[PDB]
């Protein structure tokens, strides 16, 4: 607004420069999002001969029954995956044959929790949807179709049943958003700090933490 | 430890499997290192390109002479930043001609701060180096050789002087370690804030911070 002429001139050549920034930046994010995908591809079959040799499905009825609770302690070895996970989620975790991430067809992922048929719900796939654009937009879970006397997430009977609702793993297959603010906060980002630990820590190097050596 | 060997045979399958991650791991990590390079290398240019239209020096006794105030009012312009730029701090500012990132030859980042010649210190280069393996080890910064009176990081003169050091942009250029440590780790915090800022948003869309759009 202020400038002489020759200092107008100075900065058409720097909002020219600052153009060509632009566009090679562009380039680069093209290239590394090529990179990322190339290999989000190269790694799938690992996890799926991974599954494989834990499920080899002809049958099942407990979860990754070639190498019985495999999930969960890869889980419990996490530290902050392990905080979430309290002791009566157990003995639902240990029907889990599988843990998935996806990219969705602004961005984000999906993580799938995949079930083997147990007396806790009838969903064979819990899914939590993480959308994005980094910053992040709103989620999308599964409501996990409980049976009669077998939602963890609420008390129980026995002394007239007497019911109080109580911490589990299996909050996290909630949804949420955004425009106090502070409880609505910190529930994103303990949520967020657990969805993040499972796609590129637990997902990645399961069986390591499994063995117990992360 | 404690498994069938049926159990051990799917567990050899899942080494397996972990180690071939780890190799696609590392292709990635170098690929996208590689991509990293290509791009710094055509950065450079761009940013001597515009250091040429600031500074264009047969000569120079003021900062960026073809637009004057050019860094002082693009670092102003970012709220990272300006909350540590005090107004004392101006005066010695307004002689910066450049600000540049470079890598060195676990690694780490020196930022660069070139100025003219002034009446604040001799020094025609200041330096920041962050050493790192992400995760950061320790910083190196030039030791700025201030003039006499010309101290702005204490207090000054005159009704017998009477001094008090305060606060300063240029408390920037200490040094530091670490194995009380709050003190400790919040000055590494807002100090690493800083150079994070610089190296990634005022570097690369300087004029942009200095037009007044980000």
Chains 1, 2 share one sequence.
Not at 138 to 149: G, P
Not at 168 to 175: K, L
Not at 178 to 203: H, N, S
Request: charged content about 30%; glycine content about 4%; overall charge negative.
């Amino acid at each position: 607004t202020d400038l002489t002429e020759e200092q107008k001139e100075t900065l058409k050549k720097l909002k020219l420069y600052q153009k060509e920034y632009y566009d090679y930046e562009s380039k680069f994010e093209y290239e590394l999002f090529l990179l990322r995908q190339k290999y989000h591809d190269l790694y799938g079959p690992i996890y799926d001969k991974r599954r494989e040799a834990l499920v080899g499905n002809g049958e099942a009825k407990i979860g990754t029954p070639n190498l019985p609770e495999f999930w969960l302690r890869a889980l419990r070895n996490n530290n902050t995956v392990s905080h979430v996970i309290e002791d009566h989620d157990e003995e639902i975790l240990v029907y889990l044959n599988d843990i998935r991430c996806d990219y969705i067809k602004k961005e984000g992922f999906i993580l799938s929790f995949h079930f083997a048929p147990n007396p806790f719900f009838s969903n064979s796939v819990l899914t939590k949807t993480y959308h994005m654009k980094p910053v992040l937009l709103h989620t999308e879970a599964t409501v996990i179709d409980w049976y009669d006397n077998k939602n963890i997430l609420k008390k129980n009977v026995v002394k007239v049943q007497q019911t109080v609702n109580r911490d589990s793993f299996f909050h996290f297959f909630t949804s949420h958003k955004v425009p106090e603010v502070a409880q609505l906060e910190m529930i994103i980002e303990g949520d967020y700090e657990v969805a993040l630990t499972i796609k590129e820590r637990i997902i990645p190097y399961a069986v390591d933490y499994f063995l117990g050596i992360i």
